Amino acid sequence: ADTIVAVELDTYPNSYPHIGIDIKSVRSKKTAKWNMQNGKVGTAHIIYNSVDKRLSAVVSYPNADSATVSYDVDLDNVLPEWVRVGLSASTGLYKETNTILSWSFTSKLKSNSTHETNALHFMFNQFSKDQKDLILQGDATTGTDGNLELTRVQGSSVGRALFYAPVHIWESSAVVASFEATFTFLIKSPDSHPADGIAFFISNIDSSIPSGSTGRLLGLFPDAN
Amino acid sequence: ADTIVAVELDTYPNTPHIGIDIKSVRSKKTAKWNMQNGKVGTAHIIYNSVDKRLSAVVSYPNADSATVSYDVDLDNVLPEWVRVGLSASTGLYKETNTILSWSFTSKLKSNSTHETNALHFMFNQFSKDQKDLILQGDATTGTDGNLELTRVSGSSVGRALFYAPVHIWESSAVVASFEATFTFLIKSPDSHPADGIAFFISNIDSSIPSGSTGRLLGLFPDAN
Amino acid sequence: ADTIVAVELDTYPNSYPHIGIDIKSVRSKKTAKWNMQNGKVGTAHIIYNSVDKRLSAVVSYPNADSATVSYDVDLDNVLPEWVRVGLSASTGLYKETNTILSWSFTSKLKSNSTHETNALHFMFNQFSKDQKDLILQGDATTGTDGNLELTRVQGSSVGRALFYAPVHIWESSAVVASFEATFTFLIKSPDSHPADGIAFFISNIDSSIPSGSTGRLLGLFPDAN
Amino acid sequence: ADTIVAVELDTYPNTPHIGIDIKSVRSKKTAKWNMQNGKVGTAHIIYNSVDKRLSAVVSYPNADSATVSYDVDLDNVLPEWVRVGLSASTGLYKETNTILSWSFTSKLKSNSTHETNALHFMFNQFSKDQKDLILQGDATTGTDGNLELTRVSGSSVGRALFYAPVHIWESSAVVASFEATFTFLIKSPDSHPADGIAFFISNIDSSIPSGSTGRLLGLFPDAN
Lengths: 225, 224, 225, 224
Fold this sequence. Notes:
The first copy, chain A, is mainly β. Chains A and B meet through strand 4, strand 5 and strand 15 of A and strand 4, strand 5, strand 6, strand 8 and strand 15 of B. Chains A, C: This is Concanavalin-A, 2nd part.
């Protein structure tokens, strides 16, 4: 199975819409109430550092309240050293979209050594149709008004975009490793109470959507069971 | 008087450790520090308004690192606008408190989509006339392209502050965060020297209080 | 007199609206045609580096054409080493505004020395009412919807905002010095053909608006004469 | 075959200089280079679509710098998507082509308000398993935390490419710009060594052509 660490946002009535931190399981290690806002653009900000060992996520909407969830986890003990970072989404049987308007990420490995910092950073505010630096899985596509549609714009759609370059998320010799990620999303549905999930995840480099991970398995987990 | 939050590394008797001071010289949290005389050290200080915890690591090449953290809401402690700086004091010893590099980054992300207000600077080489630094006391710039916080040749305090006020919090921001790194060199010919260096954040017109020598680091006027 | 190097945008019928590079004089060293677009947000991008010694500026409008002007100048020979960088605007006798929606700047001094880079960077996407890191001159004010109004929102208004910290723009020991600046502006007028000027400028640290620098002297020059 | 733009520094006879090569090994522009054996050098390469000029500086500590520039519209030369890398070749000499650090930054700013697509990486320490680098030929990572482009102990070519494709141009961008810095160390025991290092940009599946030894640098298949 893949190793997944995910910060996910979902409305699946398994049980209000919530934001949750998932460490290797769909049974969230920590959750907080999130008030989904149909048709508004949301902003999710994920941050981690190895001195604190605290994975944290804030989701806010313009003019509305922020939902925040934090969880103590040492990712050294959870992930491979080299990973791929990406975005996932799964639709229930409703008409709705999962559009990502922008995605940026920064990883930093600071050594013991004076000024020895290794860093990766990418920022996408505009996705082209041939976004060669992204691995698109599922029903995910780019170029859609310069956006990335993660789910098919077909109920029970699942889609994922991973950044191409493997990311060195930790190292047995860094005094501080840290990453931060931010994406803006828009979830539009015609329906009153649509079931939908978006997640930012970190997995082994060769992760693939497990067979049958639709719905609240979010394109990441093969099973709750 | 001035409002100070500081991460300080010192060896003063008054009974080596790294410590977090929130407004008083009586450290809210300290860890044991293994001062390596003549070796270059690096302090990394980090804070964000989601976790509300101030953390630091000091490391030396060969891997003795020390780290300390304190959960504090700096909105409730600091003014909205602050100046940031480096401070140091020597007891009666021949010693240096050299800063080879210092960099800082501050971000306020709004609830508004495409948020960010940011400030960042990086000093890897100090000039003799370093106009973007406010030098207080015995601090000087330029000696080897470095910053000397105390005077190089027995009781000397010095402080360097970045010129621009920094916006460290704003009421509607979804996350405020800052980060600071500085590499320092404390070189004493004496084996067990009394010395202290600190990264601090203060009201924008902080100046060295009367009597802030020794373990008060140029920061505090008393041991309250 | 101050030393001014400015990239300015103006419609003063002295003589189409143009973008011009000004080195110490209001009599632009180089100009290009600019088609002012009332009520639209424009983006100006200024870049310089000391290897090329080419000061360049691009102004674009969403969906419209770009105006670009470039000029060979070695700023080592023009400016003091330490400067203040800022934004200026002057209105003719028309009703119109000069609103800056965002301003970001980056200066970098790279030494001969391995990894010896000094850098300053600031980004404002939101200006508060008490923007303590800006020196406001003239009729300039902040907090206006989180914007900076450079001119009074009074015909023959002049206003300027300078960043607080002196900037080390060059050095006799850097192998490459460079800066880049970007700001978004909105110029609204009710009038058909309003006369207005906006500039990004670099001056000595203690520059002030010269007495009587209204109109096409832009808050920078004391005289054409 | 592969499309190459390269900034190369070499000492091959074939008659020291830094040069800009746009698709051929016959440099479009060269300047005189004063190779300092055993000293660490730093190459800085810069380009933006407004000026449409590719520029480079190589400096050594003690200030011999060399610089070269060429006015070229890289949209008309390069594919839209490229990979970037470092390349080196040794004649028959004992020598190293060590890379101590390499960093790159690419930006595409749209006409759209709040533009930016960006990529940046910074390597100051290479790992033995450096999965974000594609190593070709004799190049290896990890030796001292460094990248060795040719093999360290007579005719060796090696190239390192960053994994992710880079978007270096887009048709609606108001300015595309990139920047590259790398510090290198060429150490030969021999006084006048034949060697060449290059920063290059290629189609994303460039590989070492047959016969690209010596002055062809692992980049070109012939002297055309």
